[PDB]
Amino acid sequence: SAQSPLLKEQIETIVTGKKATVGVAVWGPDDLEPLLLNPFEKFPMQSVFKLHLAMLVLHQVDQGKLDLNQSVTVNRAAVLQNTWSPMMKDHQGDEFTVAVQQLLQYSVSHSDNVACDLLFELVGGPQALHAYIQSLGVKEAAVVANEAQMHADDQVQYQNWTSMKAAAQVLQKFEQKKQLSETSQALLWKWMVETTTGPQRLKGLLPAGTIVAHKTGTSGVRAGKTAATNDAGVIMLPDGRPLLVAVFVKDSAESERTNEAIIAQVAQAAYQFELKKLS
Numbered sequence: 001s002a003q004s005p006l007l008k009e010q011i012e013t014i015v016t017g018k019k020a021t022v023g024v025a026v027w028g029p030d031d032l033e034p035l036l037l038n039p040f041e042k043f044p045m046q047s048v049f050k051l052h053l054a055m056l057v058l059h060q061v062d063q064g065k066l067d068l069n070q071s072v073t074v075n076r077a078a079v080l081q082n083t084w085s086p087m088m089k090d091h092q093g094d095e096f097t098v099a100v101q102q103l104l105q106y107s108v109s110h111s112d113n114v115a116c117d118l119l120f121e122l123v124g125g126p127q128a129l130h131a132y133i134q135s136l137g138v139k140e141a142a143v144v145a146n147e148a149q150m151h152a153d154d155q156v157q158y159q160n161w162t163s164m165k166a167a168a169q170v171l172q173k174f175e176q177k178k179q180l181s182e183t184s185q186a187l188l189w190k191w192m193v194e195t196t197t198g199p200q201r202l203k204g205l206l207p208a209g210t211i212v213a214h215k216t217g218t219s220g221v222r223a224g225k226t227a228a229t230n231d232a233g234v235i236m237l238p239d240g241r242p243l244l245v246a247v248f249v250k251d252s253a254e255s256e257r258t259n260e261a262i263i264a265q266v267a268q269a270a271y272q273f274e275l276k277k278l279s
């Protein structure tokens with residue numbers, strides 16, 4: 001039993017009248033196709049594309065071009081300034097090197113902007129990641145900018161975009177374990193499960209302790225609007241099977257609490273739809 005009528009209707013009451021454009025992808029483990037909402041919109045990804053980036057970094061690790069214990073120079077003055085980076089507060093000193101593995105964990109789990117931009121340097125920039133996304137057979141998405149360019153120009157975020165179909169496909173290609181070695185896959189799943197970002201988004205209305213591998217993303221506000229409040233992830237159902245849910249709240253005039261509640265409510269509806277199929 002795939003996407004069926006009261007699921008699409010619960011989603012209907014969650015977004016109708018909200019001053020935002022809400023992208024939705026729901027792919028339960030018995031669905032041939034994802035349920036999509038606003039499938040024709042281009043949703044700015046913000047931090048969500050650190051998942052795509054990590055998959056490319058770990059695929060180049062799997063191909064030997066890089067190594068997880070390979071060191072990278074982090075210079076406090078050289079890197080992207082005045083930005084979100086737990087790495088530049090965790091580590092003291094004017095210059096230090098960290099392993100690619102810690103760059104990955106910082107970018108994926110802590111959504112770190114400096115670590116993310118250093119991984120862009122090692123793989124060949126946004127154009128490397130744009131080619132990789134296409135190489136997975138995902139067409140309706142684009143990546144042209146890094147974190148530094150997005151911080152420099154707030155309109156540039158709209159060109160690092162994905163469609164809801166493309167959001168489902170990357171979540172599926174991550175979840176299905178076929179794009180990466182077993183060691184690389186297992187690190188990415190760990191980083192996506194162990195994040196403490198966005199607790200009120202996909203995890204917000206799920207029972208405590210529900211395993212959710214997910215990547216958040218959020219823009220800043222401008223003139224009382226938030227261009228993007230996103231969360232994309234894999235919910236582990238009680239039988240161990242995956243439920244893929246992505247929600248992208250675009251150009252919202254609602255409060256942050258409402259934007260996250262929208263994400264949470266969709267994830268809950270998809271979740272409870274799957275729970276009644278079992279015990």
Ligand SMILES: *C(=O)N1C[C@H](NOS(=O)(=O)O)CC[C@H]1C(N)=O
Nearest residue numbers: 046047048084111197216217218
């Ligand atoms: C990611 O979108 N960002 C990095 C950082 N983490 O926020 S997140 O949990 O929504 O991913 C702060 C905001 C944002 C950015 N400006 O880069």
